[PDB]
Design an enzyme around this catalytic site. Sequence first.
Site, PDB file in Angstrom:
ATOM      1  N   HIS A  94     -17.677  34.390  42.582  1.00 43.63           N
ATOM      2  CA  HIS A  94     -16.828  35.482  43.129  1.00 43.63           C
ATOM      3  C   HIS A  94     -17.681  36.482  43.907  1.00 43.63           C
ATOM      4  O   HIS A  94     -17.670  37.680  43.597  1.00 43.63           O
ATOM      5  CB  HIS A  94     -16.048  36.155  42.010  1.00 43.63           C
ATOM      6  CG  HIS A  94     -14.932  35.325  41.494  1.00 43.63           C
ATOM      7  ND1 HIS A  94     -14.997  34.690  40.283  1.00 43.63           N
ATOM      8  CD2 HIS A  94     -13.715  35.064  42.000  1.00 43.63           C
ATOM      9  CE1 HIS A  94     -13.872  34.047  40.070  1.00 43.63           C
ATOM     10  NE2 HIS A  94     -13.072  34.253  41.109  1.00 43.63           N
TER      11      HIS A  94
ATOM     12  N   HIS B  32     -17.623  33.543  48.894  1.00 39.14           N
ATOM     13  CA  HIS B  32     -16.199  33.302  48.532  1.00 39.14           C
ATOM     14  C   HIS B  32     -15.285  34.125  49.446  1.00 39.14           C
ATOM     15  O   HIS B  32     -14.323  33.565  49.975  1.00 39.14           O
ATOM     16  CB  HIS B  32     -15.978  33.594  47.046  1.00 39.14           C
ATOM     17  CG  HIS B  32     -14.556  33.493  46.621  1.00 39.14           C
ATOM     18  ND1 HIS B  32     -13.851  32.305  46.663  1.00 39.14           N
ATOM     19  CD2 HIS B  32     -13.699  34.418  46.162  1.00 39.14           C
ATOM     20  CE1 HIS B  32     -12.625  32.506  46.216  1.00 39.14           C
ATOM     21  NE2 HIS B  32     -12.508  33.798  45.903  1.00 39.14           N
TER      22      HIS B  32
ATOM     23  N   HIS C 167     -10.462  40.615  48.964  1.00 38.62           N
ATOM     24  CA  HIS C 167      -9.535  40.274  47.850  1.00 38.62           C
ATOM     25  C   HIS C 167     -10.264  40.261  46.504  1.00 38.62           C
ATOM     26  O   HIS C 167      -9.576  40.357  45.487  1.00 38.62           O
ATOM     27  CB  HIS C 167      -8.786  38.959  48.118  1.00 38.62           C
ATOM     28  CG  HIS C 167      -9.536  37.743  47.689  1.00 38.62           C
ATOM     29  ND1 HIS C 167     -10.547  37.202  48.451  1.00 38.62           N
ATOM     30  CD2 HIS C 167      -9.412  36.951  46.604  1.00 38.62           C
ATOM     31  CE1 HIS C 167     -11.037  36.141  47.835  1.00 38.62           C
ATOM     32  NE2 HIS C 167     -10.361  35.962  46.706  1.00 38.62           N
ATOM     33  N   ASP C 168     -11.584  40.079  46.474  1.00 37.40           N
ATOM     34  CA  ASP C 168     -12.365  40.029  45.206  1.00 37.40           C
ATOM     35  C   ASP C 168     -13.462  41.109  45.173  1.00 37.40           C
ATOM     36  O   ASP C 168     -14.410  40.948  44.406  1.00 37.40           O
ATOM     37  CB  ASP C 168     -12.953  38.637  44.982  1.00 37.40           C
ATOM     38  CG  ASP C 168     -12.061  37.654  44.238  1.00 37.40           C
ATOM     39  OD1 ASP C 168     -11.212  38.071  43.425  1.00 37.40           O
ATOM     40  OD2 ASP C 168     -12.262  36.462  44.445  1.00 37.40           O
TER      41      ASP C 168
ATOM     42  N   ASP D  15      -7.334  31.250  48.405  1.00 35.73           N
ATOM     43  CA  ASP D  15      -8.185  31.567  47.242  1.00 35.73           C
ATOM     44  C   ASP D  15      -8.639  30.288  46.542  1.00 35.73           C
ATOM     45  O   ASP D  15      -9.788  30.263  46.083  1.00 35.73           O
ATOM     46  CB  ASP D  15      -7.439  32.478  46.289  1.00 35.73           C
ATOM     47  CG  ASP D  15      -8.369  33.243  45.384  1.00 35.73           C
ATOM     48  OD1 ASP D  15      -9.588  33.296  45.679  1.00 35.73           O
ATOM     49  OD2 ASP D  15      -7.867  33.763  44.401  1.00 35.73           O
TER      50      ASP D  15
ATOM     51  N   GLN E 153     -10.615  19.529  35.436  1.00 35.83           N
ATOM     52  CA  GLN E 153     -10.306  19.605  36.893  1.00 35.83           C
ATOM     53  C   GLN E 153      -8.997  18.847  37.173  1.00 35.83           C
ATOM     54  O   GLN E 153      -8.114  19.417  37.837  1.00 35.83           O
ATOM     55  CB  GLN E 153     -11.501  19.101  37.705  1.00 35.83           C
ATOM     56  CG  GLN E 153     -12.657  20.095  37.730  1.00 35.83           C
ATOM     57  CD  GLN E 153     -12.253  21.408  38.359  1.00 35.83           C
ATOM     58  OE1 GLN E 153     -12.039  21.495  39.564  1.00 35.83           O
ATOM     59  NE2 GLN E 153     -12.110  22.439  37.539  1.00 35.83           N
TER      60      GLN E 153
HETATM   61  N1  LIG Z   1     -11.714  24.141  41.012  1.00 35.46           N
HETATM   62  C1  LIG Z   1     -11.163  25.163  40.215  1.00 35.46           C
HETATM   63  N2  LIG Z   1     -10.808  26.315  40.793  1.00 35.46           N
HETATM   64  C2  LIG Z   1     -10.285  27.307  40.111  1.00 35.46           C
HETATM   65  C3  LIG Z   1     -10.108  27.116  38.743  1.00 35.46           C
HETATM   66  O1  LIG Z   1      -9.564  28.120  37.999  1.00 35.46           O
HETATM   67  C4  LIG Z   1      -9.204  27.831  36.630  1.00 35.46           C
HETATM   68  C5  LIG Z   1      -8.284  28.904  36.033  1.00 35.46           C
HETATM   69  C6  LIG Z   1      -7.956  28.533  34.566  1.00 35.46           C
HETATM   70  C7  LIG Z   1      -8.587  29.624  33.664  1.00 35.46           C
HETATM   71  C8  LIG Z   1      -9.638  30.341  34.567  1.00 35.46           C
HETATM   72  C9  LIG Z   1      -9.000  30.283  35.985  1.00 35.46           C
HETATM   73  C10 LIG Z   1     -10.474  25.899  38.152  1.00 35.46           C
HETATM   74  N3  LIG Z   1     -11.004  24.947  38.907  1.00 35.46           N
HETATM   75 MG   LIG Z   2      -9.638  37.262  42.374  1.00 37.80          MG
HETATM   76 ZN   LIG Z   3     -10.885  34.904  45.032  1.00 36.37          ZN
END
Ligand SMILES: Nc1ncc(OCC2CCCC2)cn1
Ligand SMILES: [Mg+2]
Ligand SMILES: [Zn+2]
Length: 313
Positions: A68, A72, A106-107, A217, A269
């Site tokens: 982040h 990003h 945004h972050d 995002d 994933q």
């Molecule tokens: N490639 C990828 N990108 C974003 C991700 O966020 C995961 C969410 C679940 C709890 C934390 C946020 C996960 N994998």
């Molecule tokens: Mg964010």
């Molecule tokens: Zn972001």
Amino acid sequence: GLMQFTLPVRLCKEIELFHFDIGPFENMWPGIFVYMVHRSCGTSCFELEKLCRFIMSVKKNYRRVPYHNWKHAVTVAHCMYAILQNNHTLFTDLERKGLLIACLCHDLDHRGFSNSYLQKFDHPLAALYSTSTMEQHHFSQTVSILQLEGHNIFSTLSSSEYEQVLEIIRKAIIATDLALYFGNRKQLEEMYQTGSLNLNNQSHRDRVIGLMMTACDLCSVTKLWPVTKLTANDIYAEFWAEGDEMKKLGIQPIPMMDRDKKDEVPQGQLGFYNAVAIPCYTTLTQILPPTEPLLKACRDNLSQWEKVIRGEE
Ligand SMILES: Nc1ncc(OCC2CCCC2)cn1
Ligand SMILES: [Mg+2]
Ligand SMILES: [Zn+2]
């Protein structure tokens, strides 16, 4: 304002594509962002001296976290640029101005921790902002930088246009709260399917910009496999640090954040592509047909993760 930004030939061509990677040269990222604003918005949208000072203050207010971070911010802005360039006539002047700045900002000042961890830690920001904690903070940091002397890139806007652009930016930044995405996508799915989706309805535009913000995002999942795979390491570096901080508060983290369960990454994933990414890019392709390459790249990456699980790579 006869000073154009140009990129080397390979970048000039590849930057138009959804799957562009901005590369490892940090000092080229401001120029890449300005290039995108000029082609997306016009060479007159912003005073260049003000924009450059805005960009460098935004960069300084991103932290050195694994994911982040400033890279990003620019990556998410580039995804928005590609969406805007493939949907030229669908967006107003103020929307194009607002959304690239929203993506860059945004972050802002992210510490590499979820809203959940702030709440469980009992961070002051969790008292100030009960929901979308980090996102209200990102928008607060945006307004702060905009209020620095010589940093107001919206100076030539009317009073009403100014309130409009800051409202676009606020809604866009709040929409990056993934907890809000599920309900938002569901509502867009219903509206498109029942045929009530109306782009002249401001509340409908808001939802569509919300989904675009989620799409931009999450865009690591829409790159070519080598970029997606290497970005996944930075994403998990943060998740595992947060899991460690949960264990310090005496709370077992979700397995996605537990670095003892690295073996479970490929299956995590899979769940994420199935539960979040594929639905996100499916609904976005339905509302905005020219964003189909994002859905295609996401499906390719899902297939690559299935191959990791079968031990084929
Ligand atoms: N490639 C990828 N990108 C974003 C991700 O966020 C995961 C969410 C679940 C709890 C934390 C946020 C996960 N994998
Ligand atoms: Mg964010
Ligand atoms: Zn972001």
